[PDB]
Design a protein around this nucleic acid. Structure first.
Ligand SMILES: [K+]
Ligand SMILES: [K+]
Ligand SMILES: [Mg+2]
Length: 1337
RNA sequence: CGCAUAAAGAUGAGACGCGUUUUAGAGCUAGAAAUAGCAAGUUAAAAUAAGGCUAGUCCGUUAUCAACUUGAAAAAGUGGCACCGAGUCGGUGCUU
DNA sequence: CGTGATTCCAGCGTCTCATCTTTATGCG
DNA sequence: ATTGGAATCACG
């Protein structure tokens, strides 16, 4: 019956827990030990931590799943093509497709001739001589007119269909037009022929280079406008240019059309949009648009083709043949030049696959860039290589046809080549003539993103509904698949249900019912005052309806002045109006009402009550579907009500956005007695004018009970389901679930007595590629040449100062100057918001400057003068996305007011008050689980108070009272943080019950700038003996009550004693490994049993395969095996290591599995399943965690005494020095007086390593390295001993560096010993254990 | 408390481009062979987690997971306390 | 000739679309 | 980045 509290520290890979009592002491208990060993009891402290691998997101699984679907559907494309061809192919060659299928198999496994295409050596050689690449064949079939072998036609069509290109361009691309300059001049011609007053003159402008520039589209537009004399990017010609290049231009202001009429060429809606714009102005400008379309084509077609198109209808295949021919010519030239000038390197270039020369480029793993890096010095160190070098710097030297950059080829080009082949060969082959659209559809068919997987009820990811029960081929897809239903289910399966009625789906945000609801909700709060009024009074239902009919239904926004004049003055005849409860501009407005009024031009239809469900369906359809065709399909039912043009205008309108209130919630549920819905009450409440909340918070009204009935239905969810529904990372969700489980186990351990308080705190927690892409886009948009000055590696951009330099165009952000790339370690990285106000260290808040003093004052936002200097530069960076909206607002906050003392107070408070929503959700879960009893009046009984702390409170407590944390010693700090949290948190609610509303979970009613500033600055000052000097009492009092919240004479002793306890329950969560079967790399054939066949029949020794399988869990099996020629049965105990691929086969029948592996007469009761991280104790406390069936991890924690931890913190100058010069001097002197600690610390590590780690060579290496550097400053030795602690850590062995020396991993690559050790099964807290003596088996 | 914007993250769908693996693309000459010299090289088929049954243009890498007992499962149930101490927890007393 | 030390190695780039939450910053 | 799988190397 002893009161206690729980403190928790939740992280992504750790959950620290601690149980404390009223005196801040951690209890200890004797726990029963189950199993077959002699040990029966163990004393353990109720402080510990759970360690687990981070929870992964589903994104990688999603990408693998989508890739699997794409491979299945590509094989289906080829299958459809072969089905079309099969009847005629069986005549031409019956075994052709069989050879294609078996082409992977080796000679002895092939059932037909080893040559796939023609089945004889002569014809195969002749084919490969005539068409060196498939593109030769494609060009021949597109251009030639004599009948081709059916096998060749199939091969070309299959190549086009299999690798078809992207669908990022909608409509048609005609490759007949490729000249940029000619089409640009034609556009200018049409513009001048239609516009004579201000003609466009652009002669003498390199249209080809500017428009096809490698820079960004926006910068290309800027460059073209720059060379356009007397033109504007927002002008009509500028809009045409933006449309052509790809940027979406607004054509409203060009013609003053009063509608946006945005025209994006790539989008399919453009056509319809274009027609709309033709209705806005006329057909005279249509020619310009036509030219713009053609111009756009050339812009995107000159990028990939770069070949003449008047002589061929296969510009892509001809471009690839040009690649082939230039590669051949350059290869011959390079061979000759190398054999003439550097004859010794030829073998390196053209024979050595390991090297990145031509042989490595073709036969080895060298990419194009690696080959260019290898060959550029050789080209430079030779004569006659000017053309080769020019090609190389243009990235056009010795190219391959199948390259990384073929991702810019639209499927329209492949479709054009396929269509040309079909037209050429259709007369010779009738089935090609009558299956032409079939094959074109095979190439171009693509399941819409809103239909998803074409499942038949066996997929958890599928939502499509089928009109008819038939197989969905690409040809009957539009007939078998219900696309409207599929798209609606696509949107609605991801959208929310309203919380009040969890089975009901939310309304569209722009629903007329929702707008009416919000308008009435705000209007019921309108408190008008006019002359002759004794007291302020609310408006009545009739007045509200009159105002809605007058103000809202005729004005988009309704203000106070319009309310006073057009209603109170015009009708009420009251010239003195003062409003209360609202602002000048009403937030709620009938935007949907006015938009529908403009679209349909009818008022009776809108105001009619009985047809409003039609409007609800209208807005729902306009919200659900973005495609004009589907909107048309759904609205066709309402075509009779409106006109055809009105139907088109409706089709154009789209209402993005959903709400949070369902239809039933607003106007579906009715009160038992009144029979009025919530909307009805909002319309006519009476004198009360209650809002929606008061309407659902009234006990007399049945709405509260109806909501409760809806909420109870479904009984919430299981803990795992409720946690998964949270908005957070899967890693933090794993942390939260483990936190709840440890709390349940701790409550069990404490005799089912629930804690008095649960104080919880959560941590706030490739990249180089993201930085590279961001800087590339920013520089391209800006138009700078900085990146061309210096090619920076991705890992080199990981430097903070370098990244800031590159993001700022190399220029100081506060003044107008330039920084030097080589003057690093000299400039200053400053924070836009000072670290005192906000502890933010991300790039979004950091600025690189030559000297920080240029910012102005260091106690506020940077000065107004700096803003006036660099606002244009900041805006240019923001438009290039080198700085964000947040960064720009922070930088320019001075001109908008700067930082008032109120903002400083708020930032000070938020450094201690945890406002994160995820922490509130965790607190709610814990409170709901702990507090369940209800009052007689149906009110929660807060038996357990859930407090939420921030990491700053505990961190500052650690720093102030020398409770220093070094994260490298061991994992105990996790546990320690949890303890400290409770120790702080409970203390706070002892000292400040009035502050519960900021810390304890629950809506407590307990609630100038300098006052709050100093209050929260010194809110934790009751712990320290001497303030500022002020000497608060030794024993702090509760305040207005008599309790000992803190006893400075003995409570600090208790905290220091707790942090020095050697036994802390650190548990690594044992997990069965799931995921990929093995390494994905397909290795070449070799005679090794570690190769895994990629198919049943693909024997690895002849076809290669996978290796490195991941072990799901090991299996301790005691059985017999055959030994010797006589195959005598030897008894063996062994770890098998069931891999992920073998797991299902093993669990289906373990005995059959083990007999297949070779073990005989296994004991199914003696088989032990051992997941990863299974704990074993061997001797002297040496603990090994099973990492796999053949590898062990360290499983021991080093309990370094607290004095060494504090000395290493001070000596390392953790986070530099943040103390007063007097205290810093005292601590530095303490370090100097305590140099000998270093030796002692080393001894600690050494003795620990001699008992547990057992890495003899690494320990000797470490000792020698330490002896080498004994003359270094104490600080550097301290930092490097912090590094040294990696030798003794728990978990996987790692490599560490002591100064210069690097000590590599000593790995325990043998699990033989653990077969005769003590396996330990630990509960989540580790308090409950079962020890199995495996040597007894 | 309500709107607008931006960023980040989560989830799902539809698609591209490569990469890899085996086979095909008769390598030739001098050679007894070792090999040497020369020539050639750019392409394609197929697989792209083994595979499964539910046979779909589906599904197969997320989440969840100590032990023991009751179980389809979800899951439920199983382990005295106090005190003195502390090198990973030990001991003493009370109790059962 | 086993066995500990050592070395090496690991699928990756892009685009379109939708929904949700959370945080930051204005406005109100 | 990490950390287990695999091959290879050095050597008593
Ligand atoms: K797992
Ligand atoms: K466990
Ligand atoms: Mg497959």
């Amino acid at each position: 019956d002893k009161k206690y509290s729980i403190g928790l520290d939740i992280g992504t890979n750790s959950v620290g827990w601690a149980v404390i009592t009223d005196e801040y002491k951690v209890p200890s208990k004797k726990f029963k030990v189950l199993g077959n060993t002699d040990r029966h009891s163990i004393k353990k402290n109720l402080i510990g931590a759970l360690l687990f691998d981070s929870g992964e997101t589903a994104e990688a699984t999603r990408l693998k799943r989508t890739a699997r679907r794409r491979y299945t559907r590509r094989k289906n494309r080829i299958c459809y093509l072969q089905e079309i061809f099969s009847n005629e192919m069986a005549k031409v060659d019956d075994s052709f497709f069989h050879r294609l299928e078996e082409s992977f198999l080796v000679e002895e496994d092939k059932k037909h001739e080893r040559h796939p295409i023609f089945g004889n050596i002569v014809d195969e050689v002749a084919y490969h001589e005539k068409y060196p690449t498939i593109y030769h064949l494609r060009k021949k079939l597109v251009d030639s007119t004599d009948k081709a072998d059916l096998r060749l036609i199939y091969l070309a069509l299959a190549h086009m269909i299999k690798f078809r290109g992207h669908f990022l361009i909608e409509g048609d691309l005609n490759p007949d037009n490729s000249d940029v300059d000619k089409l640009f001049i034609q556009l200018v011609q049409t513009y001048n022929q239609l516009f004579e007053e201000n003609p466009i003159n652009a002669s003498g402008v390199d249209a080809k280079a500017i428009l096809s520039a490698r820079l960004s589209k926006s910068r290309r537009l800027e460059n073209l406008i720059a060379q356009l004399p007397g033109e504007k990017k927002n002008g009509l010609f500028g809009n045409l240019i933006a449309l052509s290049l790809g940027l979406t231009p607004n054509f409203k202001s060009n013609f003053d059309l009063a509608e946006d009429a945005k025209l994006q060429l790539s989008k399919d809606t453009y056509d319809d949009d274009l027609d709309n714009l033709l209705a806005q102005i006329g057909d005279q400008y249509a020619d310009l648009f036509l030219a713009a379309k053609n111009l756009s084509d050339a812009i995107l077609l000159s990028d990939i083709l770069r070949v003449n198109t008047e002589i061929t209808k296969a510009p892509l295949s001809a471009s690839m043949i040009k690649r082939y021919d230039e590669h051949h010519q350059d290869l011959t030239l390079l061979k000759a030049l190398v054999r003439q000038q550097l004859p010794e390197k030829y073998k390196e270039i053209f024979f050595d696959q390991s090297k990145n020369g031509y042989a490595g480029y073709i036969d080895g793993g060298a990419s194009q860039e690696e080959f260019y890096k290898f060959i550029k010095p050789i080209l430079e160190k030779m004569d006659g290589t000017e053309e080769l070098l020019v090609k190389l710097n243009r990235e056009d030297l010795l190219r391959k046809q199948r390259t990384f950059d073929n991702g810019s080829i639209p499927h329209q080009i492949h479709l054009g080549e396929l269509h040309a082949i079909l037209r050429r060969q259709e007369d010779f082959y009738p089935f090609l003539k009558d299956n032409r659209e079939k094959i074109e559809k095979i190439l171009t068919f693509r399941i819409p993103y809103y239909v998803g997987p074409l499942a038949r009820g066996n997929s958890r990811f599928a939502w499509m509904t089928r009109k008819s029960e038939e197989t969905i081929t690409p040809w009957n897809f539009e007939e078998v698949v219900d696309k409207g239903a599929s798209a609606q289910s696509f949107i609605e399966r991801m959208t929310n249900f309203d919380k009040n009625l969890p089975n009901e789906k939310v309304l569209p945000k722009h629903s007329l019912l929702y707008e009416y609801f919000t308008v009435y909700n705000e209007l019921t709060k309108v408190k008008y005052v006019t002359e002759g009024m004794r007291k302020p009074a609310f408006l009545s239902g009739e007045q509200k309806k009159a105002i809605v009919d007058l103000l809202f239904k005729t004005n988009r926004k309704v203000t106070v002045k319009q309310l006073k004049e057009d209603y109170f003055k015009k009708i009420e005849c009251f010239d003195s109006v003062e409003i209360s409860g609202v602002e000048d501009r009403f937030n709620a407005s009938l935007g949907t009402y006015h938009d529908l009024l403009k679209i349909i031009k009818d008022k009776d239809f809108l105001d009619n009550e009985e047809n409003e469900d039609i409007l609800e369906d209208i807005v729902l359809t306009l919200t659900l579907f973005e495609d004009r065709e589907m909107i048309e399909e759904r609205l066709k039912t309402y075509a009779h009500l409106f006109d055809d043009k009105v139907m088109k205008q409706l089709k154009r309108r789209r209402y993005t956005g959903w709400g949070r209130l369902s239809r039933k919630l607003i106007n579906g549920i009715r009160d038992k007695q009144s029979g009025k819905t919530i909307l009805d009450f909002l319309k006519s409440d009476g004198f009360a004018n209650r809002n929606f909340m008061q309407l659902i918070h009234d006990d007399s009204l049945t709405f509260k009970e109806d909501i409760q009935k809806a909420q109870v239905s479904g009984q919430g969810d299981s803990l795992h389901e409720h946690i998964a529904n949270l908005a957070g990372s899967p890693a933090i969700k794993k942390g939260i679930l483990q936190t709840v489980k440890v709390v349940d186990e701790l409550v069990k351990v404490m005799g089912r007595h629930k804690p008095e308080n649960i104080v919880i705190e959560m941590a706030r927690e490739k990249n180089s590629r993201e930085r590279m892409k961001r800087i590339e886009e920013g520089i391209k948009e800006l138009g700078s040449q900085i990146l061309k000055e210096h090619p920076v590696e991705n890992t080199q951009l990981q430097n903070e100062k370098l990244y800031l330099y590159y993001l700022q165009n190399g220029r100081d952000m506060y003044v107008d100057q330039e920084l030097d790339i080589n003057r690093l370690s000299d400039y200053d990285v400053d924070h836009i918001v000072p670290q005192s106000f906000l502890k933010d260290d991300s790039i979004d808040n950091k600025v690189l400057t030559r000297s920080d003093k240029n910012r102005g004052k260091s106690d506020n936002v940077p000065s107004e003068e700096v803003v006036k200097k660099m606002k244009n530069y900041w805006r240019q960076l923001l438009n290039a996305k080198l700085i964000t909206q947040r960064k720009f607002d922070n930088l320019t906050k001075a001109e908008r007011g700067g930082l008032s003392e109120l903002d400083k107070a708020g930032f000070i408070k938020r450094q201690l008050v945890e406002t994160r929503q995820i922490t509130k959700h965790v607190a709610q879960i814990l409170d709901s689980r702990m507090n369940t009893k209800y009052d007689e009046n149906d009110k929660l009984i807060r038996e357990v108070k859930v407090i939420t702390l921030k990491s700053k409170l505990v961190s500052d407590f650690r720093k102030d009272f020398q409770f220093y944390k070094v994260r490298e010693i061991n994992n105990y700090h996790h546990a320690h943080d949890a303890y400290l949290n409770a120790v702080v948190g409970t203390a706070l609610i002892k000292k400040y019950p009035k502050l519960e509303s900021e810390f304890v979970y629950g809506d407590y009613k307990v609630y100038k700038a300098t006052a709050k500033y100093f209050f929260y600055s010194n809110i934790m000052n009751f712990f320290k003996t001497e303030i500022t000097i002020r000497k608060r009492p030794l024993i702090e009092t509760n305040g207005e009550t008599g309790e000992i919240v803190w006893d400075k004479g003995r409570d600090f002793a208790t905290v220091r004693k707790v942090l020095s306890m050697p036994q802390v329950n650190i548990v690594k969560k044992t997990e069965v490994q799931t995921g990929g079967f093995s390494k994905e790399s397909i290795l070449p054939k070799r005679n090794s049993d570690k190769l895994i066949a990629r198919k049943k029949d693909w024997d690895p020794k002849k076809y290669g395969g996978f290796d490195s399988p991941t072990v799901a869990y090991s299996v301790l099996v005691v059985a017999k095996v055959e030994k010797g020629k006589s195959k005598k049965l030897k008894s063996v105990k062994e770890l098998l290591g069931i891999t992920i691929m073998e797991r299902s086969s093993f669990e289906k029948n373990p005995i059959d599995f083990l007999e297949a592996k070779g073990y005989k007469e296994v004991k199914k009761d003696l088989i032990i399943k051992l997941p990863k991280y299974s704990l074993f104790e061997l001797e002297n406390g040496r603990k090994r965690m099973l990492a796999s069936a053949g590898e062990l991890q360290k499983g021991n924690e080093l309990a370094l005494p607290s004095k060494y931890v504090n000395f290493l913190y001070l000596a390392s100058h953790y986070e530099k020095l943040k103390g007063s010069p007097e205290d810093n001097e005292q601590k530095q002197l303490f370090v100097e007086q305590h140099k000998h600690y270093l030796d002692e610390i080393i001894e600690q590590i050494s003795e620990f390593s001699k008992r547990v780690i057992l890495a003899d060579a690494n320990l000797d290496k470490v000792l020698s390295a330490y002896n080498k550097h004994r003359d270094k400053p104490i600080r550097e030795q301290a930092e490097n001993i912090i590094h040294l602690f990696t030798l003794t850590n728990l978990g996987a062995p790692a490599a560490f560096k002591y100064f210069d020396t690097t000590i590599d991993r000593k790995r325990y690559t043998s699990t033989k010993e653990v077969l005769d050790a003590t396996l330990i099964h630990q509960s989540i807290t580790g308090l409950y254990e079962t020890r199995i003596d495996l040597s007894q088996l």
